[PDB]
Protein: Cellulase
Organism: Alicyclobacillus acidocaldarius subsp. acidocaldarius
Amino acid sequence: KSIFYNQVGYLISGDKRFWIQAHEPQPFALRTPEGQAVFAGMTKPVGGNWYVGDFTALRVPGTYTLTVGTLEARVVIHRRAYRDVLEAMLRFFDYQLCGVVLPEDEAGPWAHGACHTSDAKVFGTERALACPGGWHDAGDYGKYTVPAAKAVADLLLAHEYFPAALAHVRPMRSVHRAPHLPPALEVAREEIAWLLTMQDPATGGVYHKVTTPSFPPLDTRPEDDDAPLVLSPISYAATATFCAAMAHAALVYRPFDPALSSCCADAARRAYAWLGAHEMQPFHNPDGILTGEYGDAELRDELLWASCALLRMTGDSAWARVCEPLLDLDLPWELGWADVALYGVMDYLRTPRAAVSDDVRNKVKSRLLRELDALAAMAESHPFGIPMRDDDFIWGSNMVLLNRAMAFLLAEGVGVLHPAAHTVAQRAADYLFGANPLGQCYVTGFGQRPVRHPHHRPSVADDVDHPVPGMVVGGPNRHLQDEIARAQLAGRPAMEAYIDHQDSYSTNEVAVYWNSPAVFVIAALLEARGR
Ligand SMILES: [Ca+2]
Ligand SMILES: [Zn+2]
């Protein structure tokens, strides 16, 4: 029996909520460390087994003792409560850097020399290509184009939406080149640079991934992983998502890195040329390649994103002829990594009105609003106020949640101002930081119940009780898709289908594209912005 709360903290100007399992209202108090009450109220029912207490009106920063029944919790209120965790979430990307020295003065215990420095062989050939840099994808050391595109897009969108919040954090600054770009762009450039090396100069197509044939032991340090690197074949999905990300990067970097901006624009155009001359073939692992497939049978949303990205990059109305029929399809409007249509919708909506059809544009805005309404109804039913149903708690459920919060916030940039947007964002953070049935903070290195045993090779290699901080784990997954989950979590409700165990890859791994929406959402919460 405990209090469930945001274990990282609460914003002075933000909503403040705790949860408890109870069957009737109870008085609660918030007190100073000496013990004197500064706030008091009554809990109220929200369904399932749950009651909530609202202490939003407490505006004075500090560490308070929350008392309800015979239970106590320590809660922090601060002007920028999430600054440290946002910084850690962004530093994760630098911790994932491949082929670059990470010095101890930046990386502490996890400092290491440049890893995976060898040339990658193109599958089914004797040709070798240098594809250095960028990020290890997850708990493994593969670098995969499709999910990379999402992580880049999310960081770029965070820079575009919340630059002031991001300005207050510091990545591994000394590992990046001077002059230093704004934090999100400094970090994202490393991945963008690597992506550019994955494009085949002859055809404009993009290799699906570069990995070793198989996964090394969970125990393996990055610099000790010396198996041969293989470039898996060019794929439609990789080429299209590369196109979209590069087109996005072209726009965003224009005033910061003109050479990169220009390089990305032309790379995007060459990638789109490839799309036009090739079939929408889903990617499957070649024989002898057992690493992450990142497959996907539906590719029209990738074409949609690429098309809309180039529409916005160029501002040329000719692109709307291709975009608008794709926007009419009943594709899910989601934020990846496989279902990427909402990135395209956003690029379309963020293009000057003059370049697109007014009729189509209003239909797209209207669909977006209806989608958000649906998510808002979900959140209203849920005891923790998050836009989730039991069946949404799948592999990477934390990302499912964060993408949904992100959609609310993105919409505010294109004239769709849903009244639940900022409540949803706060509840998503609350949930991520311990306001859930397990009382689990789903980020390593933070909260009172942090993640301690992530499925992450650098963490497992160094200290299995003390992992790299700032890593957002996948979260509860009702499908029990690893040995540990099957054995330990059968019969538990959806939100309880998580275990902090290094072998539980289906509930407790990490990913660049799980940190990326988290950076966006937490940055939004820091940029406190009503009248
Ligand atoms: Ca797709
Ligand atoms: Zn590496």
